[PDB]
């Protein structure tokens, strides 16, 4: 459904690692996440590129979001998890 604020601003959600209460898992800065039809969750940075964030949208044809990956200290990648269900419990 519909994010459950008043003016969702189309459902589309500006974020930040400050407004999603978890470590960035990106290189990038802060961003928008935004749910399509067909249980799809889709991430788009701050220039304008639209990237997967599920292996669903990935399915789809929106692009790997891996180029820009984000390790954690000793090395070793990040998950995109806690951003993905945050993302699609939004739009519950």
Same mark, same amino acid.
């Not at 500006?14 to 935004?34: C, F, K, Q, R």
């Not at 669903?56 to 000793?74: M, N, V, W, Y």
């Not at 990648?77 to 269900?85: M, Q, T």
């Given at each position: 459904?519909?994010?459950? @604020?008043?003016? =969702?601003?189309?459902?589309?959600?500006?974020?930040?690692?400050?407004?999603? $209460?978890? &470590?960035?898992? &990106? %290189?990038?800065?802060?961003? %928008?996440?935004?749910?399509? =039809?067909?249980? !799809?969750?889709?991430?788009? +940075?701050?220039?304008?590129? %639209?990237?997967?964030? !599920?292996?669903? $949208?990935?399915? +789809?044809?929106? =692009?790997?979001?891996?180029?820009?990956? +984000?390790? #954690?200290?000793?090395? #070793?990648?990040?998950?995109?998890? +806690?951003?993905?269900?945050?993302?699609? !419990? @939004?739009?519950?």
């Amino acid at each position: 459904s519909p994010v459950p @604020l008043p003016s =969702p601003t189309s459902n589309k959600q500006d974020i930040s690692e400050a407004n999603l $209460a978890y &470590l960035w898992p &990106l %290189t990038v800065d802060h961003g %928008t996440i935004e749910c399509l =039809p067909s249980d !799809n969750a889709v991430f788009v +940075a701050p220039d304008g590129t %639209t990237y997967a964030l !599920n292996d669903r $949208a990935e399915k +789809a044809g929106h =692009p790997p979001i891996t180029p820009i990956r +984000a390790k #954690g200290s000793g090395g #070793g990648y990040i998950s995109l998890g +806690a951003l993905l269900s945050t993302t699609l !419990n @939004l739009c519950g």
